[PDB]
Amino acid sequence: KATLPDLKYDYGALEPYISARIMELHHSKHHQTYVNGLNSALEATAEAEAKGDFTKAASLAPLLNFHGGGHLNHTLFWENLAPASREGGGEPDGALKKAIEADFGSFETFRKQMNAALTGIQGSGWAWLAKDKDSGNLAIVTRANQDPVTGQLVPLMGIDAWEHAYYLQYENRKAEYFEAIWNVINWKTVAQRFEKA
Amino acid sequence: KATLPDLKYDYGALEPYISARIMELHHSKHHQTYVNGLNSALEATAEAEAKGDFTKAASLAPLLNFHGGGHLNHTLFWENLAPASREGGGEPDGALKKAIEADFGSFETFRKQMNAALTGIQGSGWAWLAKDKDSGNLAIVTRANQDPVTGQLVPLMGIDAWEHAYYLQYENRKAEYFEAIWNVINWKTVAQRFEKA
Amino acid sequence: KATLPDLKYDYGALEPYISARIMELHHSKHHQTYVNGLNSALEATAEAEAKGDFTKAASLAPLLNFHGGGHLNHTLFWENLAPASREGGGEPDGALKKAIEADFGSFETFRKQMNAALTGIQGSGWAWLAKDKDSGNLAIVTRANQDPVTGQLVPLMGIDAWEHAYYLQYENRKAEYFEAIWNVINWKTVAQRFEKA
Amino acid sequence: KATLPDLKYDYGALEPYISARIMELHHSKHHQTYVNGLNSALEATAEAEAKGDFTKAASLAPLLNFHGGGHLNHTLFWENLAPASREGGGEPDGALKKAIEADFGSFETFRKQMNAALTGIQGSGWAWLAKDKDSGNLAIVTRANQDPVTGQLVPLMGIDAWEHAYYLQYENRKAEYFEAIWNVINWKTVAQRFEK
Ligand SMILES: [Mn+3]
Ligand SMILES: [Mn+3]
Ligand SMILES: [Mn+3]
Ligand SMILES: [Mn+3]
Ligand code: NA
Ligand code: NA
Ligand code: NA
Ligand code: NA
Ligand code: NA
Ligand code: NA
Structure with missing residues (x-):
């Protein structure tokens, strides 16, 4: 499944421009939540589809977009920060x-x-x-x-x-x-x- | 796999309120397009997931919503028409x-x-x-x-x-x-x- | 012209539930910004309307929605807090x-x-x-x-x-x-x- | 007052690519409706602001976008058609x-x-x-x-x-x-x- 990528530096290595506590919360809390929500969404789409419940599978599209977007967006974000x-x-x-x-x-x-x-x-x-x-x-x-x-x-x-x-x-x-x-x-x-x- | 439901009457049964041409197109063309799009979205999502490509998986959320939504909505629509x-x-x-x-x-x-x-x-x-x-x-x-x-x-x-x-x-x-x-x-x-x- | 309503109490009066700094910023910075933007939008709509520039007039709608909504919401919001x-x-x-x-x-x-x-x-x-x-x-x-x-x-x-x-x-x-x-x-x-x- | 712009040709001038019926409907019914709709929104926003009713004024923002957008989009549209x-x-x-x-x-x-x-x-x-x-x-x-x-x-x-x-x-x-x-x-x- 999807995992939280580690950062290439310590949370406080972008100070004074971005605070350590922001880098910490943002990566370990917010992004982690998008990783978790991305795996939960794919798993529900899967289990609903094996049951032929397309109403349920299609009803997960917003959560797949939100969390799948979040995971992607943040991954590219840390990458272009140094x-x-x-x-x-x-x-x-x-x-x-x-x-x-x-x-x-x-x-x-x-x-x-x-x-x-x-x-x-x-x-x-x-x-x-x-x-x-x-x-x-x-x-x-x-x-x-x-x-x-x-x-x-x-x-x-x-x-x-x-x-x-x-x-x-x-x-x-x-x-x-x-x-x-x-x-x-x-x-x-x-x-x-x-x-x- | 999702399928286009048949109507419970013929395309022209709802005339003069809705024309047979509208009903025919709306069902055979429009709803069918949503069915195909739904199965395609769901196939492409699973294909991606097996290859650990969450970027691709998430990118299909809009189509899953749209086509998944069209399928459900039209399905119920036909059912509440007689x-x-x-x-x-x-x-x-x-x-x-x-x-x-x-x-x-x-x-x-x-x-x-x-x-x-x-x-x-x-x-x-x-x-x-x-x-x-x-x-x-x-x-x-x-x-x-x-x-x-x-x-x-x-x-x-x-x-x-x-x-x-x-x-x-x-x-x-x-x-x-x-x-x-x-x-x-x-x-x-x-x-x-x-x-x- | 729209104006910032006054709170019925001191900024720190909703502590410990909401901090004083939050109330302060939320009221004097964020809400004040919506009030300013709302007036700015309504002045701009009038200035274009008088010049027959309907392109400009219409383009100001998102700002009118954004600021005028923010004005209404926060006004109401302060009123149901005590x-x-x-x-x-x-x-x-x-x-x-x-x-x-x-x-x-x-x-x-x-x-x-x-x-x-x-x-x-x-x-x-x-x-x-x-x-x-x-x-x-x-x-x-x-x-x-x-x-x-x-x-x-x-x-x-x-x-x-x-x-x-x-x-x-x-x-x-x-x-x-x-x-x-x-x-x-x-x-x-x-x-x-x-x-x- | 915003007004419906005149087309620079007859409604059937774009056939066989766009029908006379579509053109007539699109211009005389749809765009006209955006014109009336815009003027109404600007009016009611004018009424509201004078009353000091800023809740009513802001509530008209969706119609202003929709009608004002429709007026602009179709104006340009006919101009890039001949x-x-x-x-x-x-x-x-x-x-x-x-x-x-x-x-x-x-x-x-x-x-x-x-x-x-x-x-x-x-x-x-x-x-x-x-x-x-x-x-x-x-x-x-x-x-x-x-x-x-x-x-x-x-x-x-x-x-x-x-x-x-x-x-x-x-x-x-x-x-x-x-x-x-x-x-x-x-x-x-x-x-x-x-x-x-
Ligand atoms: Mn973020
Ligand atoms: Mn339909
Ligand atoms: Mn706020
Ligand atoms: Mn049009
Ligand atoms: Na980084
Ligand atoms: Na270029
Ligand atoms: Na036809
Ligand atoms: Na778009
Ligand atoms: Na804001
Ligand atoms: Na709006």
């Missing part, structure tokens, strides 16, 4: 940089639009840098709740805008979080994602 | 009639409010008479697209408000469709559901 | 208590159903005890984000399930918050609302 | 041709993508070729119901996937409609919107 002193922060280079410039004008303009995109989210949700699977063309998208980036879009970089991703440190000052997190984004990971398939 | 010369039309009686009367004042008022609810649906959707699983109180709810009536509420009588349910015969004049369909509602089916919920 | 030493806590009496018994069997069943409702919200949202304006029947509903309770239902008592409502004090342990808040619900306010709806 | 014999059909030229070829690979690749997006719409909705207001970066997007394309994205070409846009002629065969409509898309208009 300590500022090491591979976190800065900006991309090579092929990824060139497409960002060609699709957004500059990295700085992309940053602004993404922060703007994050700001505009009403309630719980995510903003993503994504590409078209076929052309590679880049876009800034947002997702409500745990809805994922899938299908025609491949996700490259995600910032979680749920209140639980920042409130303990930044409280209602969500702008400060959105500005701060760029220091711990791992653009090496984003490039790998972009430069593949 | 030719006017038989079990269709008229008004409910017995415990059902008293329950309608309790929660809506009269059958006529319920019929008025449901017609309004159908009229107020923006885009594609369904209106249902539903029953609270604990108290038994009745209400009119609306659902977008093919989202089902599930959880706290049990569906008893549905009317489809997607344009394919009426456009060939009534065009934009949805109010005429909503008024006409009461002539072919199977209140014997509804009362059966009412007894078991 | 200190335990005073009007807060306990159980309702009179017509309300009995109406609750009629539609949920007991006050405690309703309580469990409310907490179950709150817990089941995916993402940001609210749970309400509402009353049907025609039948007088009570029900528990949920709303996404700041989507209000309007139309056929009249809100009677609301609980806020957005994370900023509890996270500083309860962190991810929302069930502690949902359980804890009943000690500061103002049933007399809810009773006034019941009487007049 | 009789095949004239401004309709064919391919876009100019820098718009170049952009599509840059962003999608080919017009043929782009077309298929949109047709697939349109087919992929669950329920009522639209598909749009849009550009980013700041970069000119093209995207295919979809909107539920009458939700419009505003803000960071500028719509350039819309195709309506509501069932009332095709069912009378094509019935359930939505793909037939999606493939057909390309012979009456006005790319001159789409090219204007692109050049802003």
Whole structure:
């Protein structure tokens, strides 16, 4: 079944940009809950279907979307987060940089639009840098709740805008979080994602 | 494996209220598409799960909801329709009639409010008479697209408000469709559901 | 122009159930932001309407829904909260208590159903005890984000399930918050609302 | 007062690709209903605000989005439609041709993508070729119901996937409609919107 991926660093390795207690709760509590809920959903869909109860199997689709989205979203999230002193922060280079410039004008303009995109989210949700699977063309998208980036879009970089991703440190000052997190984004990971398939 | 149920009468039995062409298409084409989509979603989900691809599994949630919802909703829809010369039309009686009367004042008022609810649906959707699983109180709810009536509420009588349910015969004049369909509602089916919920 | 209502008590007066900092931010930051956004939207709608720019006028709808809902919800929310030493806590009496018994069997069943409702919200949202304006029947509903309770239902008592409502004090342990808040619900306010709806 | 815009041709001018009956219904009944609906929402929002009733004003937001969106979407829709014999059909030229070829690979690749997006719409909705207001970066997007394309994205070409846009002629065969409509898309208009 699905498992919680370990982090590549200690919970407090993203300070002062994200607090240890946030990293701790977020990974060990919130994501774990999505892992658990993802396994429970697949198991119920399975057991309902072996019984020919499609009404029941189809009634689990929202929980599969919520938890399956959560597990995926957070997995990609830790992956593109890293300590500022090491591979976190800065900006991309090579092929990824060139497409960002060609699709957004500059990295700085992309940053602004993404922060703007994050700001505009009403309630719980995510903003993503994504590409078209076929052309590679880049876009800034947002997702409500745990809805994922899938299908025609491949996700490259995600910032979680749920209140639980920042409130303990930044409280209602969500702008400060959105500005701060760029220091711990791992653009090496984003490039790998972009430069593949 | 999920299957398209046959109707209990011929495609033209509900004329003049719903045309034979509408019924034919609605069943043979539209509902069939939902059945196939449901089995396809469920196969693709199991295929993924065996290969530990939870990303793919979760990505199929929308199609499971949509097609799983279409199958259930249309299944119940056909069941609460019957030719006017038989079990269709008229008004409910017995415990059902008293329950309608309790929660809506009269059958006529319920019929008025449901017609309004159908009229107020923006885009594609369904209106249902539903029953609270604990108290038994009745209400009119609306659902977008093919989202089902599930959880706290049990569906008893549905009317489809997607344009394919009426456009060939009534065009934009949805109010005429909503008024006409009461002539072919199977209140014997509804009362059966009412007894078991 | 819309204005921030004043609380009827000091920020720390709902302790230990809700912390002072939470009440402070929730009222002076979050609600104040909705009030500002609502006025901003209504000014913008008027400015475009006078220029015959109906494209602009329509585009301001999500903001009008978002802020105007947030204004309504929180206004109501402060009104059905009070200190335990005073009007807060306990159980309702009179017509309300009995109406609750009629539609949920007991006050405690309703309580469990409310907490179950709150817990089941995916993402940001609210749970309400509402009353049907025609039948007088009570029900528990949920709303996404700041989507209000309007139309056929009249809100009677609301609980806020957005994370900023509890996270500083309860962190991810929302069930502690949902359980804890009943000690500061103002049933007399809810009773006034019941009487007049 | 918002008003129903005039079409620049007779209702039967888009046949055999869109029928006279669909066109007449779509314009004279559906869009007219969005026009009246918008004006009513703006009125009641005007009434409400004067009364200091902000609960009533906010409660009108769903209708404003729905009707205001429908007015905008259909306005643009007729503008990017024209009789095949004239401004309709064919391919876009100019820098718009170049952009599509840059962003999608080919017009043929782009077309298929949109047709697939349109087919992929669950329920009522639209598909749009849009550009980013700041970069000119093209995207295919979809909107539920009458939700419009505003803000960071500028719509350039819309195709309506509501069932009332095709069912009378094509019935359930939505793909037939999606493939057909390309012979009456006005790319001159789409090219204007692109050049802003
Ligand atoms: Mn999160
Ligand atoms: Mn149908
Ligand atoms: Mn709040
Ligand atoms: Mn249309
Ligand atoms: Na990490
Ligand atoms: Na591009
Ligand atoms: Na907020
Ligand atoms: Na709205
Ligand atoms: Na959409
Ligand atoms: Na036909």
